[PDB]
Symmetry: C3
């Protein structure tokens, strides 16, 4: 029983911890919001999971973790100075874009490790994450649709294309479009790495190509909500099978470059923003297949500009599947105000169902 | 008199045939909806015209016709399983995207004829045509604007860029941007082919560069509605004159690559979605000129990605001309619920006019 | 006192001159609207300032000035024939897109000076400026957001990409993406030109890289409204400092290629569409930094297509900063119907404030 209580306390949103947090020093609240935003990249509103995510990021590369921390803290500060909202900043909804911006600006920088000047764009871009997010909200809230990772996409694409591979101050890695045909010898497929694509794929959401970091992220997801963990591994599996189907190079599948978009899409559609149902689960799997496929599409499109498909496919596929109108009630699109971790969304669906029956 | 009755029965939407169809077996209804969606690519809601279109497609290339049939039937099935709507699936509004996807995925595939594996994306993309269409509806219905061929554009562009010219499984033709200056010797203009551009242009809507297929399509349009036929030939004529004006290569004009967007735009604006009036006809001609011009623009833009301007210019130009606000009542934008073949739209306009006068 | 009265008469919108203009011949009204639209490129609704702008344009290059005049007059005529509106055409809101289209189609044409055929697209594009503008209004008016220079962007990009550098009739200059790394020797910085970037930057809004033309434009802005002049020079300064920060080539900063977007953004956000406040001024400076930064981004993105970032960054940044929702009342987004020169906007803000207090 002590265990049940404790698990209840560490699982979900940790609402009790949030209400306790609403009282202490503003700096400790900022730390809680930073951790919560770090965790919200995978649709998790949990501080302990955020600490676990930061442990994984530190495990992979310290410099990337430092940039991510700077990005999330300055995105939260910018949300505060712009008086965006409390309960959105407090829930970490203004921090995940910042941590992603920091991490993926560190990842794609050709300058090297511990290029301190890289903090200056990271300070800037993170502080622009709320602004753009608010803007997109004013467009998306008309359809009750989430902003998703759109600010990150827009801002990191701006950074990597305005800077490019050839600027003297903030170089980026060289991304070139495919020019020669690559032969895939199916006899050279390594099933060990092919199945490591699931942990690496779930870890690549945050820029990490390490299997252990992916396992740490899965542990965080499981502590938060098992439904998110299941949909995450299913999304990475559909991403790796879709990559196999579209003649993608095996190294890309091994490095999880075909999974992060799919894990995000499967988490979002399957439970997070649609009420969980077998119809909704099938819709989530279909959206994850579409997300991998459109991920290949966007990667090939944006390789011409020297950019990568960072999360664009997730945003596009999730919004497309979240906009569809259906004449069956079993595909229920939850209102944004009533969106929380998928288990609580399912409990809400049940309450609505019973009440309607009566 | 027997002839008048008969022509009435084969002309327009064949509403009597639709009400009779609402009774028979679901498979025969699926066949009717497949034919109707095949015909609706040129804004025609007619089953007999759809059979004529399939005859033309079989005349040009059997493999392309088979892919188009598979695409339209699976798009209709996907619309059914998603419970999209009846009267939209029954009117063929969920099938034209599928048939276009199949036809133009067959057309741009470098694998060859009777590459059976090509059906697998065609099965997938067609089944994704309703989803995307519904999504775009939720955005477009806010302005009472039609989805048009947007899902086709989005999905076939995704296919041709995610696959590309260099993948091992689903190769695409090589589309490269212009690099050297091409001299146009006006003395080498062939007026016979230059005027064959009209039938070939109207036939290119469906991917066919055959003059006879274009003539068959014109026959189908004439059986459906003469106004659509007139606006179709006018659109192809303005496309070929615009291509002459913009120094386009003569071979492109001969192959009808400058007409399909313009025929679609002229059909849509002139009568189909605007009440037919001399002001509306002039607006349709202007929109068709803009459609050819923006067709050159989109072709040059998307040649960098290795993609073609499939119907994007039609959608963009038609939506732009359908969004304009005007202080004169003679340019009347019909509500979507009251949209049918242009003659019935004109009869509705008259009823509204008389009623308003009284 | 005679001076006060006179300055009042030449400053602002010249409302007295407008009411007097509402009476005379239609041709003289067309001339007034042409001048007013020429002036409105920098958010100035003043005829005398428009005459000053045309004097500057004639000073730089006669052919460009002639194309700009043709574009603005034909855009006004097209707005009239489409029955768009009076008070929008009369305020010049349908002419600035036309004059910009003419000027920048002259600027980027490789055909040469006095290529009379260039008028034919200029006639066409200008007449398409109202249509597209109306279309974008129907989308933008849902959020109470201005169209801005969007039609210009869309239409001149269509022209320069459909024509390209390699067409026989309407050649364009060659814009290639960066391929080799350029070293910036900070010891070669010329502070004289570096500070001339402000006049040249403010003059580049209209395509002019001449310092004297920029000074003439600043004189026009000062006669219209000092707040616009201050925000204009501040925007050009932030553009030139941002260009220095992002390792831009010094020649681009000298030619003012980093200022026009920023001057437009700073004018728009700081006073023109937001009520002027120190918070709004800081938001305008931030938006101008974002505008320069996204200007580099769009230039690098669209260099692949052979296009330049004409005003796109201004439109994107201004709309993004005009869409943000804030919980503080000090950032006030004025309704479009109540938008005029920034001093009158500030007077309106004060009236609203006092009335609310009581």
């Amino acid at each position: 029983a002590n265990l049940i209580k404790w698990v209840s306390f560490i699982s979900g949103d940790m609402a009790a911890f949030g209400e306790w947090m609403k009282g202490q020093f503003i700096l400790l609240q900022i730390m809680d919001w930073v951790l919560r935003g770090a965790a919200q990249v995978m649709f998790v509103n949990n501080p302990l999971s955020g600490l676990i995510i930061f442990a994984g990021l530190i495990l992979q590369n310290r410099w990337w973790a430092l940039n991510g921390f700077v990005g999330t803290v300055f995105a939260t500060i910018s949300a505060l100075i712009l008086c965006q909202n409390r309960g959105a900043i407090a829930a970490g909804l203004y921090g995940y874009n910042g941590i992603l911006v920091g991490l993926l600006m560190a990842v794609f920088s050709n300058a090297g490790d511990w290029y301190w000047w890289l903090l200056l764009p990271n300070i800037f871009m993170s502080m622009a994450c709320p602004i753009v997010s608010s803007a997109l909200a004013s467009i998306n809230s008309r359809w009750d649709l989430p902003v998703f990772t759109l600010p990150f996409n827009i801002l990191v694409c701006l950074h990597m294309v305005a800077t490019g591979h050839y600027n003297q101050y903030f170089p980026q890695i060289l991304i070139q479009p495919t020019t020669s045909m690559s032969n895939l010898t199916w006899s050279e497929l390594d099933y060990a790495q092919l199945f490591r694509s699931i942990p690496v794929g779930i870890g690549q959401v945050y820029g990490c190509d390490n299997a252990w970091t992916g396992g740490i992220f899965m542990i965080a997801l499981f502590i938060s909500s098992p439904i998110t963990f299941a949909h995450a591994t299913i999304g990475s599996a559909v991403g790796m099978v879709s990559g196999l189907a579209l003649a993608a190079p095996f190294k890309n599948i091994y490095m999880g470059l075909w999974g992060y978009n799919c894990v995000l899409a499967c988490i979002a559609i399957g439970g997070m923003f649609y009420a969980l149902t077998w119809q909704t689960h099938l819709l989530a799997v279909a959206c994850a297949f579409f997300c991998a496929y459109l991920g290949s599409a966007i990667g090939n499109v944006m390789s011409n500009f020297g950019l990568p498909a960072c999360t664009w496919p997730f945003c596009l596929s999730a919004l497309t599947f979240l906009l569809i109108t259906t004449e069956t009630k079993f595909i229920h699109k939850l209102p944004l105000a009533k969106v929380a971790y998928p288990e609580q969304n399912l409990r809400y669906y049940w309450k609505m169902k019973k009440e309607e029956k009566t």
